[PDB]
Amino acid sequence: CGNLSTCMLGTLTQDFHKFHTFPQTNTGVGTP
């Protein structure tokens, strides 16, 4: 990170990483 908008883009990329591998992912980011 380095500024707010970059942390929000990073959190969006983590959120996409979550939703890419799995649907229920909010309990297990790389897990079924």
Surface-to-core class of residue 30, CB atoms within 10 Å of its CB (0-12 exposed, 13-18 middle, 19+ buried): exposed
Method: NMR
Surface-to-core class of residue 18, CB atoms within 10 Å of its CB (0-12 exposed, 13-18 middle, 19+ buried): middle
Contact 29, 17 (CB under 8 A): yes
First to last CA, the chain: 29
Q: Report the C-alpha gap between 17 and 31 in whole angstroms.
A: 12
